[PDB]
Symmetry: D2
């Protein structure tokens, strides 16, 4: 079937920014610290006393997303640690209104998203380490969880979506999703519901591993269409981790964003804020670099969809389709030098594709408007382009050629 | 043969910061732009008129180098473009004193290096695109080159070294190195001479490709010992290149620093300044991350030397030797979770080495002082350590265990 | 659940020989030729008239299987082409009794297997190109299929097993497996039933992994019947003989695949395609000779050895197999030992580590030459490190096996 | 510089058969056994007493070489062990005339080669373990070596070439090659001289890459004599026969190595080790049968084809070979074609591109079945793109060859 309108709109977002921020951030040793480091719960939960949010500016967060070319932001409203970054209106004492911050961060967040035309999404951990209900009274925990979501559904106006994480902790339990998701549909009919593991008809989006090779499953031929989403964090941790030096290359990040679109998914890129809610400078660097790429890729990043056009043997190239154009996404290009300074990209570089049966008028690189030479066999639907290398002084990692039809 | 004292001192520096800054920086399309983009020379050289150096602060640069754990800085005093960043005292109009900057940047540079206990090195391009002498009167060009170096030898006090680049452009010419290097020895007996391509007895250091697998040659058995040096830049270009998004991972940078020491070389890490002489934000990020690693690695980074101790099959681990300790440099480690949360590092992880014949007392990770369990076969010189994984919230990329002997 | 006795005995077989032989073999262009080459059915089926079986010697085949270290043989009794290599007792004219051969090859086959202590298994294609019943009256086809199997169950004595192939052609149909397999259990209670699916019934004993090599075997849901696993490899790209298929795997890959099967707790079938007249072709003999040397050396662990929670150190493909009296280190990526002047790669000390051994060890020795290995243990952390010496010059076993003897 | 005529003729041979046979063969643990296994020389050299050559038939060997598509054979006339397979006419007692064989095997060899139109080449080890002169009196050893070659140059008629091996053992010695090779040129002006050193003299015609496969061939300094190149492959890890070396390469890798040699402008020797009594072992026969199918198919280009500055698309291992009338696309990594219902991998359109062809093309066709290929050209940028169709079911050539016909 056809995607519901809100899921079409979701797939058009393309790229989101994931933001991890909680009490864990003050320790800068990763978001699972309370459990994995076997911390004393009483002592860990005292971090609420120093949660000032002194450097959280939701406008700067929203601006970061805008600059990277993201169209939505997923904020951690409550992680496994169980601390709420919003006013739970009496549900819990373990929330930002009982911290020196005394600010509803979610309220600030939603306002900042709307000012930048971004959808606000709320991450909610369903595996909870704070409330004894989780282990001691799971049905009552489900009521608590659902109430926590109800607050997010009812106090902030329209919400882009919800991002649930933790049902995997009790794979065999009845999580009462008809009632949780049904409550969401009542207050937030157009919210996107994402469950990180379909576990319920009301799910709109399924999550996958970034190295999923093949196109995404969209559901059975006569069932509801569900979108897909991949996630990457810049190092090994999601929350800030000061001694995690194992950052990915910006090149891998770009390739992963491209790859998401290739397989018909969205992608979240994650940053972990500091204890006080600042975007770390390391993250800003990744945002600037990916942001250059996404600005260049704008004509296809959002509306582009996978299409049955494959690339030749031995190539990682791929094709994205919009209603007016096809786009060749071309990888493993090298920089062009001279006759006596050779950087690798100077030879004619035929890249082929199978599945285009219409005569083409023009093909051009989005980065510099260079027109490419090509040949077609329309009977067998072959396209071969001379994919010229990068002008010296540039390297886009994934280069994009726009096809214009006759 | 034994290294001369200045070469011993050089090998103890370990890590240097390479800085590319010239007129090319204003175009932000790489340092070879004038040639590779077939620019009109007159028009390109007009960039001198906008060379203000308005954001060059040598003290900040020196401080950054100190913080990243560098012990020397190689600054581009004149690149292929042929513009001098110092007062050529009559040799050329194409220098910083004929630009609005009106400051001897090399003078600022050496003062700042000395304040931070760093050795200043001068990069000098021997392949020159500015002077017609280069092609049309090579003997006169050699005199010009030599005079340009003489200025550097005589007007700035003691100089850590010279880094020459371009003899490869005319492989078969007589470059009159006895007289160039002899002049350097007269005024700067303790300068390190590096020629990038041994091309002369006075050479102290040879350069290698960062992917050199094996320990480097130090010269024929009865001749002068020469050191080795590798270089890495963060993306594909050396000068700043705004649309080169193909940055290497911080992890690769760390591994390359470690690798240099493994093969008995120094390593330069290169940044390209902005047009006005600022360190770009992206470079700051790589320097912050590497700086955390080098601070942890300080007990071995400087004094550590290769030693005939190899690692077991299938690992990239290696050993570095100081007079009192050996150090296991261990790669491809994973982070430790729980029984419920598996991140990869939780099993016992036997990493073996061959070549240690002395009984060991204690082995401990430099990052957290955890004591490691081990076994030895002293007859066959096998050491096997349980290389425990990273504490959750950390990842050093290259982890270092110090061995203490009985 | 634990394996039924017949499935335990099956897992002890370890290695089987798969044999593809039918009319297709005369054309030597693969076993799917009739369909994939769009052959005229009348003209293709005339190959029965030249099916002499003139070089089929079941005794020699069984001997060769024994020598390669196989403990069972899966022979194609009828492939998709629909020709039966046995006397169908009037079910069909399209069988060996209507060919000049005039011999029940399956009868010769099972006699030969029994003489060599091998289990005979019968491959039976369930997707059938010969009888028009397959498309025009599927229920009647199922009766035909079932009767073809019934003959095999009733006229040859005890049968090691059945290997069904083709239900994947009609993924949505009711194949009436309760009745097919129930009939088999009536006449052949101890037969292993294998269905190649590309668990389809409670009576299934083995699940198949054809031309894919996975990392773990499915043994069934934790409270259901245990089923074994089996991997199948053919030497080139085809199963039937294919004269211009030059794309043979290395004998080294075959040995590694056999070892790998055992590592993950499966059996492995290695497939050969006979010539038109039923000879083992020379290329297959070569792979059999080479594998046979390996399996003879590996015999102490190949059959009884089972996977065990003992892992190998980072960066190695080594593994451990367990018998009731010994553990065995299966060690890969070794090189040959030369001298100081001739270095071939294997001469240095070569520490290979394992995690999961908690008992003090007395002696460790290579199966191929009884060389004693030096080792160290940390019993608290269950670490074993051996100096895995390289191959003596003139040998290379691909997968080398060290036997551990305990205190 | 272009190759002298005899070196052009050598480059047209394309493929040779390397044959290792000596006393070592009886032990079947590799040809270096005497040294590497630290054997007592007296005891090892007793093997002469059982050297019967009872199964050496040079005619059969030459026929096999012809059938595999080889155009020359390099036979070990004397290996490091120092035993001569020919009548040394009094130079040594350690020769076949002092063994029960009592036959000049080299004489049989050259006769058989000539009957089959093959060039006989003589391998001669220059590092010699038998004569004490080697270490005790190197000048006298050089005379001995030279005399041994003189016999080969004078008693067997015209000789295709000499293949020397061992100067690497004394890298700094004066081997007096002007005099050795000058003696060869006196008696055998057209002999190809190969020296394995892994240009040591002006008279060298061929440089080797033994057990290493590069991406370009050195043809000598730009203004000096052109020297050809030759790659060597053995089927397992040893050159002499090695019964417990199971680490055989795939037939596919052998075919790809043959193709690769031609791509980079070299010949290739494929090596077999005979049994103790001089038989081709069955394993070697298998590789020869399979390679022989490929070389028969490839005959239009294997011999005359040369490298040409035409490169293949990104991510492809394809390449081009040039004859005076045609170009040939050598295409790798193809898959077999099934049906709509049976997908084996090769069925989709498969554009394989090349850069460097500037002439309009008339027809392109696969050598194996004459199928005509569709293609497109951009003559300005010299791009050719072919739909490289997959293998017909039942075949897989590993390296498939399309012949281009020009306008």
């Amino acid at each position: 079937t056809e995607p519901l309108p809100r899921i079409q709109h979701y797939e058009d977002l393309g790229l989101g920014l994931f933001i991890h921020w909680g009490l864990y951030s003050q320790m800068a040793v990763g978001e699972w610290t309370e459990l994995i480091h076997h911390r004393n719960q009483h002592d860990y939960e005292q971090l609420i006393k120093t949660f000032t949010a002194a450097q959280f500016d939701a406008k700067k967060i929203a601006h970061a997303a805008k600059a990277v070319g993201a169209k939505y932001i997923v904020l951690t409203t409550k992680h496994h640690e169980g601390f709420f970054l919003y006013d739970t209106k009496g549900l819990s004492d373990f929330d930002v209104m009982h911290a020196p911050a005394r600010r509803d961060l979610i309220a600030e967040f939603v306002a900042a998203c709307r000012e930048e035309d971004l959808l606000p999404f709320f991450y909610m951990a369903t595996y909870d380490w704070h409330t004894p209900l989780y282990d001691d009274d799971f049905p009552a925990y489900l009521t608590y969880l659902q109430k926590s979501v109800e607050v997010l559904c009812r106090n902030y106006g329209p919400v882009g979506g919800f991002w649930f994480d933790g049902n995997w902790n009790k794979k065999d339990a009845d999580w009462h999703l008809p009632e949780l998701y049904g409550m969401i549909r009542h207050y937030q009919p157009n919210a996107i519901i994402v469950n990180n593991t379909v576990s319920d008809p009301e799910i709109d989006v399924v999550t996958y591993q970034r190295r999923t090779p093949d196109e995404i499953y969209h559901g059975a031929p006569n069932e509801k269409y569900v979108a897909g989403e991949i996630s990457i964090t810049l190092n090994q941790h999601w929350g800030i981790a000061a001694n995690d030096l194992n950052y990915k290359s910006p090149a891998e990040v770009i390739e992963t964003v491209a790859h998401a679109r290739h397989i018909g998914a969205n992608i979240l890129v994650n940053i972990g804020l500091t204890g006080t809610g600042a975007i770390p400078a390391a993250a800003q660097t990744y945002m600037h670099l990916l942001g250059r790429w996404t600005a260049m890729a704008a004509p296809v990043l959002y509306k582009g969809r996978p299409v049955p056009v494959t690339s030749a043997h031995g190539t990682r190239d791929f094709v994205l389709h919009t209603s007016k154009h096809d786009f060749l996404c071309i990888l493993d290009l090298q920089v062009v030098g001279n006759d006596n300074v050779v950087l690798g990209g100077e030879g004619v570089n035929p890249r082929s594709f199978v599945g285009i049966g219409q005569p083409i008028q023009r093909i051009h690189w989005l980065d510099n408007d260079e027109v490419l030479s090509f040949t077609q066999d329309l009977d067998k639907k072959v396209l071969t382009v001379d994919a010229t290398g990068y002008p010296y002084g540039s390297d886009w990692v994934v280069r994009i050629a726009q096809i214009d039809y006759e």
